[PDB]
């Protein structure tokens, strides 16, 4: 139902573009009459403008936003909720204490995957970027996201770990069976 959400569903048997195929190369059969692909989108641009309009106290002094950086803070598979932090470079007039200034802020937003509906959980204070470069601000922003996830880091079970493998490694370990492959 909302304008910020877009959902697409496609079925197969023998927005982002999908080149669904078999192990050989055949592009299968794209139809809606088996494989099931789902695509739930969340437009950052819409969310930012919506949260500033209704949930930012400083919303009246806002002019326009420039770049934005989205860092996921939490994924709850039981409640199907994605907690995203929205780093934002914007233009706004200051308090009556004008002249338009560049500021940086953080917008925490909870995104429901069952409904597709987002909810705002935090609106940051407008902090001035005085002669700090674009890289300076995004580095400090991400550093705060890292800081938070580490602060709230609760150890997960053995069996619920996301395995991540990459080689540009001395040993390939099978932790659970205390087996190493020495390279």
């Amino acid at each position: 139902e909302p304008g910020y959400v877009n959902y697409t569903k496609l079925y197969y048997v023998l927005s982002l573009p999908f080149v669904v195929t078999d192990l050989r190369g055949r592009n299968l059969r794209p139809m809606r009459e088996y494989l099931t692909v789902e695509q739930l989108t969340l437009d950052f641009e819409y969310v930012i403008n919506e949260v500033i309009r209704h949930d930012a106290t400083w919303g009246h002094q806002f002019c326009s936003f420039s770049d934005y950086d989205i860092v996921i803070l939490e994924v709850c598979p039981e409640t199907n909720q994605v907690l995203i932090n929205i780093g934002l470079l914007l233009l706004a007039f200051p308090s009556p204490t004008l002249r338009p200034k560049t500021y940086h802020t953080s917008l925490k937003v909870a995104w429901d995957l069952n409904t597709g509906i987002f909810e705002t959980v935090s609106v940051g204070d407008l902090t001035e970027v005085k002669g700090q470069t674009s890289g300076s601000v995004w580095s400090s922003y991400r550093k705060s996201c890292v800081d938070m996830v580490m602060k709230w880091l609760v150890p997960e079970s053995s069996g619920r770990y996301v395995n991540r493998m990459t080689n540009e490694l001395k040993v390939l370990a099978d932790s659970e069976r205390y087996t190493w492959i020495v390279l």
Binding site: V154, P155, E156, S157, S158, E176, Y178
Partner: protein, 783 residues
């Protein structure tokens, strides 16, 4: 397809927990005992303990606490199972009718969160404001205790301290306050937090964090007027309460770790402390009355009372009587008296309760290697009739030698490194009290092979192995074309510098004229974990290699073939030319010895992650496994492509609820098993039709038989690990089906209602109560 039936021969005997309180009536002083899944309720009467009722919970009892919220005339019981089933139970008696009411229940498991190292901890606030649960690292679960609401909405609070050792709720606090010992890279520390039900968060604790002893292992919440907390370590005992900080470092406690405590006096003036060696102490809190009415703690004193069984838990009862709940030995009722006896002890045993656990090995009528340390014994079980043979040291392995009319028992005793040259024993035991003894050629564990008479169980001979040599495996058999029967021992060299064994021996002994003669020795480059007679050859597993040895006419072991694809080949079982290999970390595998090839052939392997405890061959095509998560599983050859034949399928799954250390050989076959809790069970095979009838009967019994705490039987017996949860398959709970004979006649008719089904090799029956009574009665005769 494989169909199995599991039934209990002997219920668990080890005591995991015990609490005192007023559960049955406000007047009755009760004793509640937890024996794994079993809850025993007693009334402390003039005669001792009057049993009230024993209830089997559909779960391993992890938390057992009595509490009285305001408005209750009697204490309510809180129980949490190993599967995270939480319940508040109320005892109700109406004349001769007895009922255990489930006041509230639910599962308090989290999908996130990893089980904590020091396990599930369950604490109740003194003012019954809430229940505190430490289930996972990083999280503290709080169940609010509100009586005027449909649901008890439990919540998690983040704990920065990811490694908590022990926690308790403090007394005399305006705000519910937890006091806990935690570990971090800077050591161990004691910290407090106030618990806010309104904000669903922690607030700054009443007193500052204090640094504690490196091995500070338990917290004691001292009641009013003292208040505060006692922290017990390896070398010290401290008291903390805001301003106050008392510390005693008594040398008495240094030798052994204190592992249990029990409040004697309601005001916390005296506590009983039990250590790993079975020593019993009295912790004394000396008070000072203040003029403002309050009482302050002036000093701490510990005094040794005597010796009891190695206590898992202690509970003071009434009139100087203490219940000693033992896990490694027999449970006791001990009397405390002010006048010391002949040895100077203030503790006198009143009663002894047989505990078969841990069954670390057994023989077949049944002979087990029971208990550990000073509680080490042999137990002879037949038609149940139990005979106990005290060893006063750890029995490890047992084997029977019919031709010598004796048993071979591997055992270990603790000796201490003193001011003098070598080491000396602390207590007399089987290995030091044998009729005759020998020593090998060419604190610490001293390993021995004991020759014990099959009739008297007298220690005929004790052979001591080399300095730092551990005896791991044992067989009694005849090898090759040699007519003689030998006691074969597999060893490992355990040094106080290295972690993994890189040296060991296979030693062939012959017992004759009351003495043991070393026939042959074979050096290995690792630990000889398991050995099995295999078609007149010796099958042995050294670290990660399974090896076949031939016995020459020259009385020597000659290696024939090797299989190297293992991580830790700990368990071996054979049937004909087939070998079932059990790995500590890599599930199971099937090998085949190829006689005309003189080598092994890797037939099939179970590709499932499983940390094995024991294995057994049911038949040529069905293999039984028991793992670390207390489940049983059955592997079958996939019944075709070579890759498909190389894959063992787990066709049977069942949550046993016990840790199996040994398997040994209507229904077909009898595999008896020994567990850590001293429970003894039987596994047997069923036909497809027998299974189908008994499974329908289980579903019908579950609709009629009620569960305490409202735990579903199906949930309880579901195969469960940290990786997966699956409903039990191809397994019948014999205990559940046997309970049909114990239900009333009107309830039997509702169970067998519109039941015919029964396809006894062909067509359908028409089942009555009497038809099934005859079925269940024949099944009770299997054990």
């Amino acid at each position: 397809m494989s169909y199995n039936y599991v039934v209990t021969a002997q219920k668990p005997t080890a005591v995991n927990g015990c609490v005192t309180g007023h559960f049955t009536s406000a007047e009755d002083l009760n004793l509640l005992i937890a024996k794994n899944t079993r809850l025993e309720i007693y009334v402390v009467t003039a005669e001792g303990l009057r049993p009230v009722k024993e209830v089997g919970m559909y779960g391993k009892i992890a938390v057992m606490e009595l509490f009285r919220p305001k408005g209750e005339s009697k204490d309510l019981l809180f129980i949490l199972t190993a599967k995270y089933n939480a319940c508040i139970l109320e005892y109700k008696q109406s004349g001769e009718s007895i009922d255990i009411i489930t006041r509230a229940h639910g599962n308090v498991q989290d999908r996130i969160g990893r089980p904590s190292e020091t396990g599930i901890i369950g604490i109740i606030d003194p003012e019954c404001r809430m229940i505190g649960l430490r289930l996972y690292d990083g999280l503290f679960k709080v169940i609010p205790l509100d009586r005027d609401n449909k649901e008890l909405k439990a919540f998690n609070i983040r704990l920065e301290e990811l490694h908590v050792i022990d926690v308790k709720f403090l007394y005399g606090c305006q705000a519910p306050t937890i006091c806990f010992v935690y570990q971090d890279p800077q050591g161990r520390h004691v910290k407090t937090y106030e618990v806010s039900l309104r904000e669903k968060e922690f607030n700054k604790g009443p007193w500052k964090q204090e640094n504690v002893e490196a091995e500070a292992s338990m917290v004691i919440a001292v009641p009013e007027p003292f208040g505060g907390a006692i922290i017990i370590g390896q070398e010290s005992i401290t008291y903390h309460n805001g301003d106050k900080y008392l510390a005693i470092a008594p040398p008495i406690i240094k030798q052994s770790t204190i592992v249990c405590h029990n409040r004697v006096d309601p005001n916390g003036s005296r506590y009983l402390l039990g250590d790993m060696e079975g020593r019993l102490f009295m912790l004394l809190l000396e008070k000072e009355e203040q003029m403002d009415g309050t009482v302050t703690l002036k000093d701490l004193r510990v005094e040794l009372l005597g010796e009891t069984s190695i206590a898992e838990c202690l509970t003071y009862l009434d009139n100087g009587v203490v219940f000693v709940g033992s896990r490694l030995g027999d449970s006791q009722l001990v009397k405390l008296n002010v006048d010391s006896n002949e040895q100077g002890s203030y503790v006198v045993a009143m009663e002894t309760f047989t505990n078969l656990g841990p069954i670390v090995d057994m023989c077949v009528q049944l002979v087990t290697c029971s208990g550990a340390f000073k509680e080490g014994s042999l137990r002879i079980i037949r038609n149940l009739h139990i005979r106990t043979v005290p060893l006063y040291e750890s029995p490890r392995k047992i084997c029977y030698q019919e031709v010598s009319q004796c048993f071979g028992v591997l055992s270990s005793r603790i000796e201490v490194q003193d001011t003098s040259g070598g080491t000396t024993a602390l207590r007399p035991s089987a290995s030091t009290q044998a009729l005759s003894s020998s020593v090998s050629s060419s604190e610490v564990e001293v390993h021995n092979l004991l020759i014990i008479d099959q009739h008297t169980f007298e220690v005929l001979h004790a052979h001591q192995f080399l300095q730092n040599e551990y005896a791991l495996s044992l067989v009694s058999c005849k090898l090759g074309k040699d007519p003689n029967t030998y006691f074969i021992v597999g060893t490992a060299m355990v040094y106080p510098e290295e972690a993994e064994p890189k040296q060991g021996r296979i030693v062939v002994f012959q017992y004759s004229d009351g003495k043991l003669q070393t026939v042959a020795e074979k050096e290995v480059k690792g630990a000889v974990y398991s050995m099995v007679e295999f078609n007149g050859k010796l099958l042995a597993s050294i670290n990660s290699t399974v090896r076949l040895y031939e016995w020459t006419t020259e009385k020597e072991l000659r290696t024939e073939c090797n299989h190297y694809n293992n991580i830790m080949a700990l368990y071996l079982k054979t049937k004909g030319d087939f070998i079932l290999v059990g790995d500590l970390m890599r599930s199971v595998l099937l090998l085949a010895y190829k006689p005309m090839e003189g080598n092994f052939e890797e037939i099939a392997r179970d590709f499932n992650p499983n940390w094995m405890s024991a294995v057994e061959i049911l038949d040529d095509d069905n293999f039984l496994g028991a793992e670390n998560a207390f489940n049983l599983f059955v592997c079958q050859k996939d019944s075709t492509t070579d890759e498909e034949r190389q894959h063992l399928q787990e066709v049977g799954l069942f949550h046993l609820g016990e840790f199996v250390n040994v398997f040994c050989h209507p229904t077909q076959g009898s595999v008896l098993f020994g567990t850590v809790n001293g429970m003894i069970g039987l596994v047997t095979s069923l036909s497809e039709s027998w299974y189908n009838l008994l499974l329908d009967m289980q579903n019908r019994l579950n609709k009629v038989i009620k569960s305490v705490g409202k735990i579903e039987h199906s949930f309880w017996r579901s195969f469960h690990t940290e990786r997966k949860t699956e409903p039990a398959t191809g397994f019948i709970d014999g205990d559940l089906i046997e309970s049909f004979l114990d239900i009333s006649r009107p309830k039997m008719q509702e169970v067998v209602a519109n039941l015919q089904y029964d396809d006894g090799s062909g067509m359908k029956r028409e089942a009555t109560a009497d038809d099934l009574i005859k079925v269940v009665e024949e099944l009770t005769r299997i054990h």
